């Protein structure tokens, strides 16, 4: 938790992240614990839920943030949930045993629709709307039987 | 000793039953002395006497 | 009562205000942008004070960026936040390098008792006329009142925020405003040669001037070290605590009821109110115990090296107390004798202890001001047990300060606390407050009584205390209401009398109307209510109209991206400790389930099961308790099952029924003994006896029993046996799938459940749930759009089928029955094989990674590169791991997991044991389950009309350097930010999208 | 836990108005297929014996 | 139907001043 | 391991009480915690040691021996030692034997490539451009025996045995002892096809421009447990039939 | 209790406080319960409490001054409770 805060702070310092704009940390494992191989998949699911809702959940068990972490100007460690106006992108970092690092970046899905035509979009919107309806039908049927 | 042991087994006669019961009581003494040593620590020997 | 509570190891410190300032700012920013707090509200000011009190350079750089990047056009609420926010930056810069301040800015309220028509007594705190500010409160207090004789807030708080740093100088002090022949309501006293304590004009003036300045400028407690007891939620003790922390005090607070509930209350106060330099230590403590008092004071003064604090107190505030009600002199027994010890003898022992610690270190010039809560009412009510004896005997400390050898270590400031209103109606005697105030007496809010007592810690009345003992009368003229017992009793009479007559008239008018209108106009009066049912939604992403989507991205982007080569997440799912991704999100984000959350969790855990058939004779359609088959309605589910749901979900003690009877309190090991003396024969089949012979040789005798065909097995002297034994293991807690979870409820069959390792059941359910989040109810629909060779599985595990490994390394050894194909089930790639063999039937890629705790990101990385190579169009991606006895034990031998026994010493509960980024973090919390995502080419997502939850922009993996530590994390992922900066004078045109689009 | 827009089934005697009323207050309901528990409830009402039989075939099953 | 009808007929200390605030004269019982 | 003689254990109930044996205080309390009523432990007041009477109804495990019918295997030539290549006793004690086969294969491979000093790569390529995309079907399978059997038998087993079992540790040791890259690491598991999967991953890692160079391949050990399990699946040749 | 200053208040002083105050209250409590048991409402026992005029003014007295001063609560509680018909207080401030 020191090594990870340090490597995000040094990523952000090197790419001239504005002083005063820190990445908001989220530590899902306060609530789920560490499932080893699954850790990143849960963090990823969370990151998509954050993207689409624009709600950043707080580390409810952050009684007291370590003094050693104040040196990292570019991180912010919230203890309560923040309902923002929107989150455009999310970093996901995993650190395995036997020297496995990983990063993924996930961008809000609305940056994709800029790249298509009003027609292609409107065609898509209608197909999705239909699928969602079928999926709800399927879900509620399979749940009860 | 071995002959005694087979006669004891035959008579359905636990030779340790005594020392068991005793070790179990020596624990309840330890426990009650700990309760009483605490009240002396709290109130003081002057007050308890 | 006298039992020990205090342990040094249970002490929680709160000191990270440098982080809570940024969270307090960003909280208030979005509160104002979503219209929750307005300009008019008094919260934006009380909040502002707290952000200024934590002003440092970091926090201005933070406020600047957040206020200088709001678009003031997007709404009125964005102009509001930017106006306020610029004000708040101007203030914060002045106050930078200025000591933070206690400033109460609450609307001063008086009591109101209402009796309605039907005789209901209501109590409400009611904005006073002519006292709208704290300044005005000190003027009211100075003028006394007729009985004390002796011959831009709430209109535009953006303007009041500007006027918080601007220190207000007053030409004339209020001391001059004190009319002659009038005793003020707050006043200090002086001891006359007769021995009595009289009102002193002069002392009282000095106090009231310091109290006036505190109301304008505010008070600092920077460098003040305070012990406080009897300061629990909803007490004066706790409004004092907020003020100390508000002015940067360092404070020890003691609880008698230590718990997560209490340790969270206190975390919440420090994070709202602790100014720069403040700390709060919360320790469990029994003031009734002599041994806890000795221990507390020794922990405060000990060196950090010996496990203490290294402090030296400047104030003790011992307000701990137990109530004794209707204990008259006949009934004084054990409770009163214990109460007397809490409230008097152990107060003396705690000042005795701080004298011995201060003297030990020859501290002669840093006295601790003791603030004793006195009463003015010694014996005048009764039924108080030994309370009056307790209170009156502290008045001996005003004399003994002159007469003994502890005045350089200790100063007494006795506060005669007066009528303080509590919460509502029942609290204190709130209903008769209004009536006592009519006599010319003044009562106080808890926040005003807090103010008065923080007065006694100002530098002026700290200065007097050090000359001579200070007796402060914070009783607002109750001295002078005569026969207060029988007065107060007359007032309660008159309210009850009135309420009872009115309620008796109301009962009869109902009866004598019910009789005239039977049950016709008293029965058709009553309406019909709609109890909501759970409409569980899939939470597909909201698609905005096209015109709103083109604002977000730049216009040059149209036709610029190759959508065949943009990876997009199209669905996701999980099985873990909080059920599904739906229920985990509710717990993670809101900390509480909705109606839909509770029903999903109750269905998962198997508490409820739908029924559509005959149910005890009649036909029925609905939910049903799965145990009793009794009908349940969704409205009843929270009340029936929410408590059960939360006990058996999440991180909690290991449940042995879930882990094949694993009881970490009792681990079967086996020791190898040599048999000293031959054993009694036991029977065995011919083949088993020959197995004992083959092993033991000379050391066993096997003989046919000629009748049966069975064999005797004499194990002889020198033979080896294994005798079982039992370790007690110290890792007792884990993040376990919610008790009840069964692959049957999802629709997996008993044939598949018997064949397969349990981790593979988590995976199958995650792959289905993920395809439903993607609106793909029938996986074979993929093969309308894509070849059978274009669907991939790039998911994996750190360790794999870890129950199957136990099968082949332990259960075979113990000649237990184990399926012949157990080895297939252990492989990390079989989970994927089952997903293909039961759902997908692709002939597409399969690249199973092992990445220990990073397998899920490695999986994404492999999944993306498999798509951008045109090997696959769609990919399942993710990770899974189980929790079993063997890995729990091995993660313990590596000292990677938290030792649960250490955690219990610290007084932690299972919930609060995974605490990332925290001072006290001491290892991780093993959990189990799976997470799956479905990723596609964006092209193919738009063609299929599947929901698109996010774009996977980047996914990388890095190793670290030369080492000799396999579990040591490194910096190697820094390389995702590798760029050259030798030549950074002029902007590269390759970053400008306009340029890039021109070239296309 | 609100109180019903349809208090008395007397209000159904100008029925288009009472449907407008219910689906104005719950517009989701215009854009959602019947929940599978609400199909079952609907067919359970079609079998209610203390009621004139419904003048329509609501499902092809064994019944 | 007879079977179904058969089966239907069977069924039908606190030393922290959180509670009372004893530091205050009036919390006791004034 | 002698496939002609496999130690299994059978669970017997003791009909008749045993002869006392001595044990330390802590070991005796472990027998008590397990057996309860069915064991009597008593201090021997002179020594401080404890008697352990195992009583009637107590469970014991008695060893026995299967004769196994898979007698033959393709084994590294008898004599082969990581010492002869230059690997040290500190590394040999720490590490699962499959990891010694791997270290020697990665060196020998760099010599077939005329790269005698792996760090020469970093004259031509960034530290982030060397990958390891090699893997195993089952991994450190002697370390698994350590945590699932040797601990159960309270034999001595290194505290960090679990790290050695992971299929990705072999690669970690290769990075930690030779390469020191910060380049990709995508460890596959593909049972008997891990080596081709490794090549595939290795190529796609290069054609994505994540890595310029990649180590690629496969490793597996032969131990008693997997031999037996491949026999229960009837996958291996029965040597007695042969 | 001699040369027991506030640093040194321990077991002896806590016991002395019980002799000189709490068990005085328990003894008047007991005579109230016995007098009430028998409905004696008209034969009160005059309690004569030894008071001090010197509360804290010498020191080294342990909890003596706290003991003595807390009996002055009985002059108020005689009006405020239900034991005035059983008991009367006559506090004697005994001098040199």
PDB file of N, CA and C in Angstrom, chain C residues 539-584:
ATOM      1  N   UNK C 539     -29.311  -2.862 -14.875  1.00  0.00           N
ATOM      2  CA  UNK C 539     -28.389  -1.696 -14.814  1.00  0.00           C
ATOM      3  C   UNK C 539     -27.525  -1.693 -16.075  1.00  0.00           C
ATOM      4  N   UNK C 540     -28.157  -1.753 -17.242  1.00  0.00           N
ATOM      5  CA  UNK C 540     -27.530  -1.417 -18.535  1.00  0.00           C
ATOM      6  C   UNK C 540     -27.271   0.080 -18.532  1.00  0.00           C
ATOM      7  N   UNK C 541     -26.217   0.567 -19.228  1.00  0.00           N
ATOM      8  CA  UNK C 541     -25.852   1.975 -19.194  1.00  0.00           C
ATOM      9  C   UNK C 541     -26.835   2.857 -19.938  1.00  0.00           C
ATOM     10  N   UNK C 542     -27.171   4.024 -19.367  1.00  0.00           N
ATOM     11  CA  UNK C 542     -28.117   5.001 -19.966  1.00  0.00           C
ATOM     12  C   UNK C 542     -27.489   5.559 -21.233  1.00  0.00           C
ATOM     13  N   UNK C 543     -28.182   5.439 -22.369  1.00  0.00           N
ATOM     14  CA  UNK C 543     -27.754   6.014 -23.674  1.00  0.00           C
ATOM     15  C   UNK C 543     -28.484   7.331 -23.882  1.00  0.00           C
ATOM     16  N   UNK C 544     -27.698   8.395 -23.977  1.00  0.00           N
ATOM     17  CA  UNK C 544     -28.142   9.789 -24.164  1.00  0.00           C
ATOM     18  C   UNK C 544     -28.502   9.968 -25.631  1.00  0.00           C
ATOM     19  N   UNK C 545     -29.267  11.021 -25.995  1.00  0.00           N
ATOM     20  CA  UNK C 545     -29.500  11.334 -27.404  1.00  0.00           C
ATOM     21  C   UNK C 545     -28.208  11.789 -28.108  1.00  0.00           C
ATOM     22  N   UNK C 546     -28.054  11.461 -29.394  1.00  0.00           N
ATOM     23  CA  UNK C 546     -26.807  11.675 -30.180  1.00  0.00           C
ATOM     24  C   UNK C 546     -26.245  13.086 -30.044  1.00  0.00           C
ATOM     25  N   UNK C 547     -27.106  14.097 -30.027  1.00  0.00           N
ATOM     26  CA  UNK C 547     -26.697  15.525 -30.009  1.00  0.00           C
ATOM     27  C   UNK C 547     -25.916  15.818 -28.716  1.00  0.00           C
ATOM     28  N   UNK C 548     -26.217  15.106 -27.629  1.00  0.00           N
ATOM     29  CA  UNK C 548     -25.608  15.276 -26.277  1.00  0.00           C
ATOM     30  C   UNK C 548     -24.293  14.484 -26.164  1.00  0.00           C
ATOM     31  N   UNK C 549     -24.178  13.418 -26.945  1.00  0.00           N
ATOM     32  CA  UNK C 549     -22.996  12.513 -27.020  1.00  0.00           C
ATOM     33  C   UNK C 549     -21.847  13.190 -27.782  1.00  0.00           C
ATOM     34  N   UNK C 550     -22.147  14.006 -28.796  1.00  0.00           N
ATOM     35  CA  UNK C 550     -21.151  14.752 -29.615  1.00  0.00           C
ATOM     36  C   UNK C 550     -20.567  15.976 -28.889  1.00  0.00           C
ATOM     37  N   UNK C 551     -21.213  16.524 -27.852  1.00  0.00           N
ATOM     38  CA  UNK C 551     -20.590  17.542 -26.953  1.00  0.00           C
ATOM     39  C   UNK C 551     -19.309  16.962 -26.329  1.00  0.00           C
ATOM     40  N   UNK C 552     -19.400  15.754 -25.760  1.00  0.00           N
ATOM     41  CA  UNK C 552     -18.412  15.123 -24.819  1.00  0.00           C
ATOM     42  C   UNK C 552     -17.062  14.937 -25.513  1.00  0.00           C
ATOM     43  N   UNK C 553     -17.082  14.388 -26.728  1.00  0.00           N
ATOM     44  CA  UNK C 553     -15.886  14.093 -27.544  1.00  0.00           C
ATOM     45  C   UNK C 553     -15.662  15.234 -28.529  1.00  0.00           C
ATOM     46  N   UNK C 554     -14.430  15.412 -29.052  1.00  0.00           N
ATOM     47  CA  UNK C 554     -14.172  16.426 -30.080  1.00  0.00           C
ATOM     48  C   UNK C 554     -14.574  15.968 -31.498  1.00  0.00           C
ATOM     49  N   UNK C 555     -15.094  16.898 -32.318  1.00  0.00           N
ATOM     50  CA  UNK C 555     -15.762  16.672 -33.629  1.00  0.00           C
ATOM     51  C   UNK C 555     -14.863  15.914 -34.613  1.00  0.00           C
ATOM     52  N   UNK C 556     -13.543  16.051 -34.448  1.00  0.00           N
ATOM     53  CA  UNK C 556     -12.503  15.457 -35.330  1.00  0.00           C
ATOM     54  C   UNK C 556     -12.490  13.943 -35.173  1.00  0.00           C
ATOM     55  N   UNK C 557     -13.118  13.430 -34.115  1.00  0.00           N
ATOM     56  CA  UNK C 557     -13.057  11.998 -33.739  1.00  0.00           C
ATOM     57  C   UNK C 557     -13.888  11.151 -34.712  1.00  0.00           C
ATOM     58  N   UNK C 558     -14.934  11.712 -35.333  1.00  0.00           N
ATOM     59  CA  UNK C 558     -15.802  10.961 -36.288  1.00  0.00           C
ATOM     60  C   UNK C 558     -14.960  10.449 -37.461  1.00  0.00           C
ATOM     61  N   UNK C 559     -14.991   9.147 -37.723  1.00  0.00           N
ATOM     62  CA  UNK C 559     -14.279   8.529 -38.860  1.00  0.00           C
ATOM     63  C   UNK C 559     -12.785   8.366 -38.632  1.00  0.00           C
ATOM     64  N   UNK C 560     -12.264   8.810 -37.480  1.00  0.00           N
ATOM     65  CA  UNK C 560     -10.817   8.813 -37.153  1.00  0.00           C
ATOM     66  C   UNK C 560     -10.394   7.488 -36.515  1.00  0.00           C
ATOM     67  N   UNK C 561     -11.198   6.874 -35.636  1.00  0.00           N
ATOM     68  CA  UNK C 561     -10.838   5.586 -34.968  1.00  0.00           C
ATOM     69  C   UNK C 561     -11.206   4.399 -35.848  1.00  0.00           C
ATOM     70  N   UNK C 562     -10.349   3.381 -35.880  1.00  0.00           N
ATOM     71  CA  UNK C 562     -10.716   2.031 -36.391  1.00  0.00           C
ATOM     72  C   UNK C 562     -11.446   1.272 -35.271  1.00  0.00           C
ATOM     73  N   UNK C 563     -12.759   1.248 -35.336  1.00  0.00           N
ATOM     74  CA  UNK C 563     -13.584   0.538 -34.354  1.00  0.00           C
ATOM     75  C   UNK C 563     -13.330  -0.974 -34.339  1.00  0.00           C
ATOM     76  N   UNK C 564     -12.661  -1.578 -35.323  1.00  0.00           N
ATOM     77  CA  UNK C 564     -12.348  -3.038 -35.303  1.00  0.00           C
ATOM     78  C   UNK C 564     -11.271  -3.313 -34.257  1.00  0.00           C
ATOM     79  N   UNK C 565     -10.709  -2.265 -33.685  1.00  0.00           N
ATOM     80  CA  UNK C 565      -9.441  -2.343 -32.935  1.00  0.00           C
ATOM     81  C   UNK C 565      -9.530  -1.457 -31.690  1.00  0.00           C
ATOM     82  N   UNK C 566     -10.751  -1.100 -31.300  1.00  0.00           N
ATOM     83  CA  UNK C 566     -11.152  -0.547 -29.984  1.00  0.00           C
ATOM     84  C   UNK C 566     -11.849  -1.666 -29.196  1.00  0.00           C
ATOM     85  N   UNK C 567     -11.280  -2.037 -28.062  1.00  0.00           N
ATOM     86  CA  UNK C 567     -11.805  -3.089 -27.170  1.00  0.00           C
ATOM     87  C   UNK C 567     -12.757  -2.424 -26.188  1.00  0.00           C
ATOM     88  N   UNK C 568     -13.832  -3.109 -25.864  1.00  0.00           N
ATOM     89  CA  UNK C 568     -15.040  -2.532 -25.215  1.00  0.00           C
ATOM     90  C   UNK C 568     -15.500  -3.636 -24.280  1.00  0.00           C
ATOM     91  N   UNK C 569     -15.904  -3.302 -23.077  1.00  0.00           N
ATOM     92  CA  UNK C 569     -16.457  -4.302 -22.129  1.00  0.00           C
ATOM     93  C   UNK C 569     -17.944  -4.239 -22.311  1.00  0.00           C
ATOM     94  N   UNK C 570     -18.524  -5.384 -22.416  1.00  0.00           N
ATOM     95  CA  UNK C 570     -19.874  -5.599 -22.938  1.00  0.00           C
ATOM     96  C   UNK C 570     -20.730  -6.272 -21.871  1.00  0.00           C
ATOM     97  N   UNK C 571     -20.130  -6.830 -20.833  1.00  0.00           N
ATOM     98  CA  UNK C 571     -20.826  -7.443 -19.690  1.00  0.00           C
ATOM     99  C   UNK C 571     -19.841  -7.914 -18.650  1.00  0.00           C
ATOM    100  N   UNK C 572     -20.281  -7.983 -17.411  1.00  0.00           N
ATOM    101  CA  UNK C 572     -19.466  -8.446 -16.285  1.00  0.00           C
ATOM    102  C   UNK C 572     -20.334  -9.009 -15.178  1.00  0.00           C
ATOM    103  N   UNK C 573     -19.707  -9.776 -14.316  1.00  0.00           N
ATOM    104  CA  UNK C 573     -20.345 -10.496 -13.212  1.00  0.00           C
ATOM    105  C   UNK C 573     -19.296 -10.919 -12.207  1.00  0.00           C
ATOM    106  N   UNK C 574     -19.769 -11.406 -11.077  1.00  0.00           N
ATOM    107  CA  UNK C 574     -18.941 -11.940  -9.989  1.00  0.00           C
ATOM    108  C   UNK C 574     -19.774 -12.715  -8.976  1.00  0.00           C
ATOM    109  N   UNK C 575     -19.050 -13.558  -8.304  1.00  0.00           N
ATOM    110  CA  UNK C 575     -19.438 -14.390  -7.173  1.00  0.00           C
ATOM    111  C   UNK C 575     -18.348 -14.090  -6.183  1.00  0.00           C
ATOM    112  N   UNK C 576     -18.716 -13.466  -5.100  1.00  0.00           N
ATOM    113  CA  UNK C 576     -17.790 -13.292  -3.986  1.00  0.00           C
ATOM    114  C   UNK C 576     -18.563 -13.130  -2.703  1.00  0.00           C
ATOM    115  N   UNK C 577     -17.872 -12.689  -1.663  1.00  0.00           N
ATOM    116  CA  UNK C 577     -18.471 -12.440  -0.361  1.00  0.00           C
ATOM    117  C   UNK C 577     -19.779 -11.656  -0.255  1.00  0.00           C
ATOM    118  N   UNK C 578     -20.130 -10.806  -1.208  1.00  0.00           N
ATOM    119  CA  UNK C 578     -21.380 -10.010  -1.103  1.00  0.00           C
ATOM    120  C   UNK C 578     -22.345 -10.393  -2.217  1.00  0.00           C
ATOM    121  N   UNK C 579     -22.217 -11.622  -2.687  1.00  0.00           N
ATOM    122  CA  UNK C 579     -23.097 -12.212  -3.685  1.00  0.00           C
ATOM    123  C   UNK C 579     -22.622 -11.866  -5.061  1.00  0.00           C
ATOM    124  N   UNK C 580     -23.381 -11.036  -5.757  1.00  0.00           N
ATOM    125  CA  UNK C 580     -23.193 -10.661  -7.172  1.00  0.00           C
ATOM    126  C   UNK C 580     -22.594  -9.241  -7.303  1.00  0.00           C
ATOM    127  N   UNK C 581     -22.190  -8.831  -8.499  1.00  0.00           N
ATOM    128  CA  UNK C 581     -21.758  -7.441  -8.776  1.00  0.00           C
ATOM    129  C   UNK C 581     -22.861  -6.436  -8.405  1.00  0.00           C
ATOM    130  N   UNK C 582     -24.132  -6.842  -8.456  1.00  0.00           N
ATOM    131  CA  UNK C 582     -25.255  -5.947  -8.109  1.00  0.00           C
ATOM    132  C   UNK C 582     -25.227  -5.681  -6.618  1.00  0.00           C
ATOM    133  N   UNK C 583     -25.244  -6.745  -5.834  1.00  0.00           N
ATOM    134  CA  UNK C 583     -25.289  -6.647  -4.368  1.00  0.00           C
ATOM    135  C   UNK C 583     -23.961  -6.158  -3.813  1.00  0.00           C
ATOM    136  N   UNK C 584     -22.832  -6.450  -4.441  1.00  0.00           N
ATOM    137  CA  UNK C 584     -21.529  -5.925  -3.953  1.00  0.00           C
ATOM    138  C   UNK C 584     -21.493  -4.410  -4.116  1.00  0.00           C
TER     139      UNK C 584
END
